[PDB]
Design a binder for this molecule. Structure first.
Ligand SMILES: Nc1ccn([C@H]2CC[C@@H](COP(=O)(O)OP(=O)(O)OP(=O)(O)O)O2)c(=O)n1
Ligand SMILES: [Mg+2]
Ligand SMILES: [Mg+2]
Ligand code: NA
Length: 335
DNA sequence: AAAAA
DNA sequence: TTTTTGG
DNA sequence: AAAAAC
């Protein structure tokens, strides 16, 4: 059957047969992100995504026939990798000073594209020179990013994610005993590692005020136990939690990035779908809804622009059915 | 950079 | 060709 | 007042 250009019409499991090609495409996309070339960035991310869905490895140029998101530029990169097992284009990016600095600087929690570009133009090349500088002033987010750097750069494994789930559930049921807590993000998609642990929290009987106060109550509780290392509440919150080694089957603990999302009970299917990801799967779900169905999808609702009506859903399956899409399992959304 | 309009 | 590319 | 966080 014909491979769709949309990640939401493809099954993408964690068995990637084309990592030689996708690692190169991911590097080229990242360089275009840094150079603020959004269009070229997105084209390399889509090409990498479609190759991740293939049930076989590309071994010749003939194998690329009929695969969407592979134009002339991308096919030239694939040809070069088939030639000698390496990408000369990705090798040039890996040796570029601007690219090396951007990767290193943005690896700090609280440092994005703008601050990384600023530090590079100031002549900084190492994290040690940035941290020891007497004129630089750091945001509260960056201070936490540097303080817990080694823990946050080492990423989270499944026993750690599960130990965090227990902490989240224990804290949440203390204030809302009927609340449903679901682990979302990469770990829901079957990943054995991740940069953080994400959760969706919802309650069938909580009031508008109870729903608003839960994240404040849960973070104050952790602050009292000395487990809240960083907190930013937007409803959602970006946290750094202290995970004691005794809770997971040196200092005796590990800093873990945790994100919590609280949503009204009736919108829980839209929120679950939006927070499960992957990022490419989400973008293509919304792109497909707009361009193929004249619908508008977000983390709270699904709207029909022609009929001028909102479509209701109690599950992810009902959202896929409204969109006219075959149901894709969470472990098949690794686009 | 690739595909739709 | 020009426009869109998640929201 | 950008900038960072998904
Ligand atoms: N630009 C983005 C980033 C994130 N998300 C959504 C989908 C996944 C969910 C969690 O985001 P992350 O934690 O940033 O990513 P991840 O899939 O969970 O991967 P990792 O396991 O490495 O954290 O939020 C999104 O729609 N668009
Ligand atoms: Mg995540
Ligand atoms: Mg996250
Ligand atoms: Na960063």
């Amino acid at each position: 059957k014909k491979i769709s250009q949309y990640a939401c019409q493809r099954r993408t499991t964690l068995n990637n047969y084309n990592q030689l090609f996708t690692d190169a495409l991911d590097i080229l996309a990242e360089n275009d992100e840094l150079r603020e070339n959004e269009g070229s960035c997105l084209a390399f991310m889509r090409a990498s995504s479609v190759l991740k869905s293939l049930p076989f490895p590309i071994t010749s140029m003939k194998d690329t026939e009929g695969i969407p998101c592979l134009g002339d530029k991308v096919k030239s990169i694939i040809e070069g990798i088939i030639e000698d097992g390496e990408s000369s284009e990705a090798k040039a990016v890996l040796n570029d000073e601007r690219y090396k600095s951007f990767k290193l600087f943005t690896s700090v929690f609280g440092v994005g594209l703008k601050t990384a570009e600023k530090w590079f133009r100031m002549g900084f090349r190492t994290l040690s020179k940035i941290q020891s500088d007497k004129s630089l002033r750091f945001t509260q987010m960056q201070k936490a990013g540097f303080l817990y750097y080694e823990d946050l750069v080492s990423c989270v494994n499944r026993p750690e994610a599960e130990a965090v789930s227990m902490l989240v559930k224990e804290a949440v049921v203390t204030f809302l005993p009927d609340a449903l807590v679901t682990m979302t993000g990469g770990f829901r998609r079957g990943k054995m590692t991740g940069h953080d642990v994400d959760f969706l929290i919802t309650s069938p009987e909580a009031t508008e005020d109870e729903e608003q106060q839960l994240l404040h109550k849960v973070t104050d509780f952790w602050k009292q136990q000395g487990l809240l290392l960083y907190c930013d509440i937007l409803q959602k919150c970006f946290l750094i939690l202290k995970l004691d080694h005794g809770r997971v089957h040196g200092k005796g603990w590990k800093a873990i990035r945790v994100d919590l999302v609280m949503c009204p009970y009736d919108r829980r299917a839209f929120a679950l779908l939006g927070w499960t990801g992957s990022r490419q799967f989400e973008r293509d779900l919304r792109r497909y809804a707009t361009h193929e169905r004249k619908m508008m999808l977000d983390n709270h609702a699904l709207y029909d622009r022609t009929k001028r009506v909102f479509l209701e859903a109690e599950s992810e399956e009902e959202i896929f059915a409204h969109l006219g899409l075959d149901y894709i399992e969470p472990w098949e959304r690794n686009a």
